[PDB]
Amino acid sequence: SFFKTTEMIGYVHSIDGTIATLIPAPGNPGVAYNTIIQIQVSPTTFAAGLVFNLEKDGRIGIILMDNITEVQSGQKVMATGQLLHIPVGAGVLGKVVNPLGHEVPVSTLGKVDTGAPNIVSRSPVNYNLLTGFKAVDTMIPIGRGQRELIVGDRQTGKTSIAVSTIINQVRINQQILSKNAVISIYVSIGQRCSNVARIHRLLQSYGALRYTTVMAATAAEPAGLQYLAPYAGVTMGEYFMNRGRHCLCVYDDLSKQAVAYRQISLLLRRPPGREAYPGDVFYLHSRLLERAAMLSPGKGGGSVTALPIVETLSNDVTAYIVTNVISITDGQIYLDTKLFTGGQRPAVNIGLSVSRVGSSAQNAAMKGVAGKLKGILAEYRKLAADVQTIPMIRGARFVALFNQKQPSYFMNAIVSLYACLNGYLDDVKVQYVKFYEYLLVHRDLGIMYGTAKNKFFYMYVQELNYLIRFFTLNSPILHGELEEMLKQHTHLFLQHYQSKMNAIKSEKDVKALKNLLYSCKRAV
Amino acid sequence: GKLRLYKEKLEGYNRFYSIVKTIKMVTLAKYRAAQGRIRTRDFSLRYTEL
Amino acid sequence: AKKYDLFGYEVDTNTAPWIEKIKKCKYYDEAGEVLVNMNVSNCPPDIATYNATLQCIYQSPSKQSTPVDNESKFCAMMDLLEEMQHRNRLKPNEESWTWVMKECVKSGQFRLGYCIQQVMETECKGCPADLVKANEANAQKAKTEGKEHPGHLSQQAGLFDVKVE
Amino acid sequence: DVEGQDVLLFIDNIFRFTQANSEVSALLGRIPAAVGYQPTLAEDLGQLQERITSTTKGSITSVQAVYVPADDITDPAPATTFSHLDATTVLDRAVAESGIYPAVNPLECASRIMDPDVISVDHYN
Ligand SMILES: Nc1ncnc2c1ncn2[C@@H]1O[C@H](COP(=O)(O)OP(=O)(O)O)[C@@H](O)[C@H]1O
Ligand SMILES: [Mg+2]
Structure with missing residues (x-):
């Protein structure tokens, strides 16, 4: 303005x-x-x-x-x-804005320089935040108000996993009360200009702009704006936090912010230290990320969840800016370059990744299945290094299930993981897990004229999602009804659908099988 | 430069240890199967000596 | 009578003023805005307050003047139950789940109704009858008219040929 | 912009722009940043590379060469450039010396249009 x-x-x-x-x-x-x-x-x-x-x-x-x-x-x-001070509110949503507040063409104000909530102002993180990934939401679960780092090399899926987390909120936000809606704030620090445009179109096509505002300081724009861009992003989120609503903040990325702050400091003769950065480059990211928090019941119980991205050069965590941000955030989501090229996408290195407040952050239903998965994948990873056990079979299917392009809905994720936990995909081969999962979610084999007879539990009824979140799968209400659905799906898939694989050994059918299975990796 | 290559040298030896440990552990299983013998042995070739 | 928060400070149990705000509701998204304003003024939602909100979700149309995409009174309703049970640590009474059963038969989503009468019968040991026959009526309504499931998805024999979209 | 046309640009080499600015920046009296480059390294590339883009009026399609000094890809001069590009082509010395020309190491490479929507499904798979 x-x-x-x-x-x-x-x-x-x-x-x-x-x-x-x-x-x-x-x-x-x-x-x-x-x-x-x-x-x-x-x-x-x-x-x-x-x-x-x-x-x-x-x-x-x-x-x-x-x-x-x-x-x-x-x-x-x-x-x-x-x-x-900058323009902040609901009226700023669905628009692109500078750190200074001017709208990019394509509301009471708030201070950008603000102190974070004190000790008695905050509370323990209990409300879950779904990224929409089976790999993340089980093993590295993010809570509302948590600061979860995203680290890894260039082209490892750092932006995509952050953007798809914003897109995952639209399916919930549309259905739920707006009090508990996750309003997103994507901050684009030092990025290329066309990359911001493609994210704008990608957010618009999935209805995300309604529940999202895009902070933007591109590479053309000066270091002053890049320095200040994450601060303007949090300011817009704190409005929702202080007024009893939950918010998300993506900084993409803090590496380029630090370089912009280093330029400013060096040009003004501030004494440089490690890797030519000033003394207070730790303080830069610390006061930013600490403003992201989970407030108490006494101050609305709102939240600002932080997803800072930090680019590493050839998997080097020992760099000064990377090591600083790791010590501030509540764990990280490490994206390995070898896993990306290997096939696993998102390429989440579960051994390197960690959530410091994982258990308390998860949903009651998601906590039930995920507690077992830690035991299975621990034994699978050890036995893979050093004859197939039950853990070896079921562990390998989880790895196949974790591959996904777009984010999964909470119901469609947890049921396909629950199937693998109790061992419904043991007789099903590893290559046909995505075809098994696709036919579970979109289609249904029991209803596909024959052995159905379930009174309520089906996969086409998406509204059961919120009943599962309340009662869990391991519960007298849904346990018997769920285990029917899976028994019908496995027996019919093994008999009618998996029988083709012994058959199909010809040209134009082996290729047809491939093109079918490759498209199944995308849609969960 | 030097920070990356000395790490990749170290990553080389990490893969070396893991693969050589696979041989170690596999040959233990064979050694356990093979030692099922020392308790027996020798008495089979009594009249082979004569 | 008296109550304390997680730190041990005094908390406003005076619920009744905030209840009458929720009764003047009009559209059910305004009820959430009130529920925010109680918590902001150190006054946590009472067990009666959640039921008063559940009433407004049933009676009114959806969010506000304009319609939102994929509206679901049930999903907004079941989220509020998840908030009171797990986070706030409050067991919903018999009134809570009766409001849920009404919305299944009113909107016509009978398949949910089958799941929630099982819920209402178990644990909280109560079968409200009135809505059970109204729910069973909608089940037979789907069968006799045409078909109960989506229909176009169910009948189509896939087997190798399935569209990916 | 004026003639409204699809155009090609060929910058050999874009490192020499950054390196040329690194010489003057020392003599101008700026304190050098990491690895002795100018503190405005990201900003210098910013204002140059952002001009190279497809507008509504026309379309630049720029191939650039990027020198990786001492075969150190973590160096600021290439590392900063990588963020700007649509198709990043990475050439490795060990691949060249083994006999494979062109010396393209395909694992470190990437392209934005490597996507089932843009190219065909058979191409991606
Ligand atoms: N989960 C995924 N599945 C398939 N492809 C992905 C996934 N995540 C990212 N990609 C692809 O990887 C490429 C780089 O993603 P991006 O998010 O830009 O990574 P970075 O932010 O590390 O550069 C994109 O072309 C994108 O299509
Ligand atoms: Mg990125």
Whole structure:
């Protein structure tokens, strides 16, 4: 927005790309620290900037934000005398916005510089946050208010897993009360411009823009905006948090923010340390991520969940910026490059990944199945290194089930995992697990004229999702009815559908089998 | 450069240990099967000596 | 009578003022906005408050003036039960699940109704009859008219030929 | 923009842009960042690479060469560039010396259009 001028504090002295220093005007008024200042580039137009250094001389260090080409030495500089406030609310949703607050074409304000909730203000994380991935939601479960890091190399699926987590909320958010809706805030720090456009279209096609707002500071835009972009993202989320609603914040990515902050610090002669970063580069990410929290019952019980992305270079966690963010966040979701190329997508390295508040974060139903999966995959991984046991059979099917492009619905995920847990996919081969899972969710073999006779439990009825979340699968209400559905599905799949594999040994049928099975990997 | 290659050298030896440990453990199973013999043996070739 | 939060501070048990706000409801998304405002003013939802909300979900149309995509009074209703049972630690009484049974027969989703009468009969040991026959009527209504399941998906013999979309 | 046309651009080499700026940046009196490059390394590539794009008016289709100094892909000059690209082609020395030309290591490579929607299903599989 058009900021509010007050007093003419000085003239522009030097410029060095996106940084400048001022000389004070006669009188020496002295602007306040960390405030916005408007530089008169022309009589009609202004150019914003943030104050970073207040030198003994009277000179004031500026980080340029807008109209950087139009800034010149000798221009007048007006001060606001206020911290950066931005447009925030429900009206900002479904739109792209700068860190300064201007909308990109394609509501009471809130402070970007704000202290995090104190000790008595927060509470333990209990509400679950579904990423929509069987690998993540079982083994590395994210709670509402948690800070869960996403680390890995370039092209390992760091953005996709973060974006699909936002897309996973639409199916719930549409059906549920808006009080418990997960409003998302995708912050795009230092990314390419067309990448933001493709995410905008991808969010629009899945109805995500209704429950999402896109913070954007692209690679063309200066370091000042990139530095400030995650802070503006949290500010927009804190509105929902402080007003008793749950929120999600993706920073993509904090690696490029740090590089932008390093540029600012080095250009203003701040003493550099490890890998040329300033002393307070840890403090940069720490005060950002700590503002993400789960508030108490006394202050609404709202939340801001954080999904910071941090790019690693050739699986090197020992880098300064990566090691800093790991020590701040509540565990991570590590994406391995060898698993990506190997086949497993999302390429979630379960051994390297971890959630520090996993058990309490999960749903009662999801906690039942997932507790066993840790025991099975632990024994499977050990026995794979060092003759097929029951753990070896069932463990391998879980690995096949974890592969998925788009996010799974909570009902469709937990039932296909429950089948593998109790051992319904033991006689079914490893290559035909996705064909087995597809025919479970979309189709149904019992109803496919014959041995049905279930009174309520079917997979076409998506509304059972919320009954399962209340009572769990291991419960007298749903246990007997569920085990019918799976018994009908296995016996008919093995008899009628899996019988083809002994048969099909010819050209134009082996290829038809492949193209069928490859498409089954995408749709869960 | 040096940070990556010394890690990949170390990753090389990690795979080396795991594969050689597979031979170790597999040959234990064969050694357990093979030692089912030492208790017997020898008395079969009594008149073979003569 | 008296109550304390997780830290041990005093908490406002005065529920009745916030109940009458939920009665003036009009559209059921406004009930959630009230439920937020109680918690904000250190006043946790009572067992009667959840039932008063459940009433508003049944009576009104959906969110507000405009319709949302894939509306589901049942899914909004069953979420609120999950909140009171697990997180807030409150067992829903006989009134709670009777509001759920009404919405199954009203909207026509009988298949849910079969599952929830099993729930209402077990544990909470009560069979409300009135709605059981109204639910069974909708079950026979689907059979005699045409078919009960989706229909186009069920009859179509797949076996190798299944569309991926 | 003006003539409204599909155009090709060929930058050999984009590292030499970054390296040229690294020389002046020292003499301008800026403190160097990681591995002795300019502190504005990401910003220099930002303003250059963002201009290279398909607008509504026309369409640039830029092939670029990127020198990886000392065969160190973690170096800032290539590492920063990787984020900007649509098809990242990575050439390995061990692949070249083994006899395979072109020396393309396919595991480190990637493309955005490697997707069942854009290319055919038979191509992707
Ligand atoms: N779960 C998945 N299944 C299949 N392909 C995926 C999955 N996640 C990501 N991809 C693919 O990997 C490529 C890179 O994904 P991206 O999220 O951009 O990774 P990064 O953020 O690490 O660069 C994309 O072309 C995308 O289609
Ligand atoms: Mg990315």
